[PDB]
């Protein structure tokens, strides 16, 4: 509360470390459905159903331009990419399995790097 603070967690490396995680998601072989925005003119249903589209190239551009205020707003957008992918794709599809697999990859790097 006023003039009463928990001890300051060192966040000065968070930017670099998020950037590294994002690199490793970008280079995973199952990243391909997630590298670029879904094309909303060519994919019937996507625009109306998926209210906040998100993809790695967009998170990378937000990260590089100071558009994440902290750690956690960066994880929310990474998770959004997989929550969208679950919303639109059957679990038994190459893209539905790709999304489950990248989400597990991401949550272990997230936990190891930061919890
Ligand atoms: C995340 N991602 C790649 C999608 O969710 C999606 C799913 C099905 C598609 N079908 C035709 C063309 N693009 C598509 C894109």
Swiss-Prot record:
The entry assigns this protein to a family as follows: Belongs to the WAL family.
Source taxonomy lineage?
Eukaryota, Metazoa, Chordata, Craniata, Vertebrata
- Where is it located? Nucleus
Name of this protein: Bromodomain adjacent to zinc finger domain protein 2B
| Chain's role | Regulatory subunit of the ATP-dependent BRF-1 and BRF-5 ISWI chromatin remodeling complexes, which form ordered nucleosome arrays on chromatin and facilitate access to DNA during DNA-templated processes such as DNA replication, transcription, and repair. Both complexes regulate the spacing of nucleosomes along the chromatin and have the ability to slide mononucleosomes to the center of a DNA template. The BRF-1 ISWI chromatin remodeling complex has a lower ATP hydrolysis rate than the BRF-5 ISWI chromatin remodeling complex.
Q: What is its quaternary makeup?
A: Component of the BRF-1 ISWI chromatin remodeling complex, at least composed of SMARCA1 and BAZ2B, which regulates the spacing of histone octamers on the DNA template to facilitate access to DNA. Within the BRF-1 ISWI chromatin remodeling complex interacts with SMARCA1; the interaction is direct. Component of the BRF-5 ISWI chromatin remodeling complex, at least composed of SMARCA5/SNF2H and BAZ2B, which regulates the spacing of histone octamers on the DNA template to facilitate access to DNA.
Which residue range or ranges hold the Bromo domain? 9-113
Source organism of the structure? Homo sapiens
Tell which residues of the whole protein are contained here: 2054 to 2166 of 2168
What is this protein's tissue specificity according to the annotation?
Expressed at varying levels in several tissues, whereas a smaller transcript was expressed specifically in testis.
């Amino acid at each position: 509360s006023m003039s009463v603070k928990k001890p300051k967690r060192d966040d000065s490396k968070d930017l670099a470390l998020c950037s590294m995680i994002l690199t490793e998601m970008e280079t995973h072989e199952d990243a391909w459905p997630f590298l670029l925005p879904v094309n909303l003119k060519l994919v019937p249903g996507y625009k109306k159903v998926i209210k906040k589209p998100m993809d790695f190239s967009t998170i990378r551009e937000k990260l590089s331009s100071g558009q994440y205020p902290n750690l956690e707003t960066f994880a929310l957008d990474v998770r959004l990419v997989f929550d969208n992918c679950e919303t639109f794709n059957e679990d038994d599809s190459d893209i539905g399995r790709a999304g489950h697999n990248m989400r597990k990859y991401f949550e272990k790097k997230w936990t190891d790097t930061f919890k």
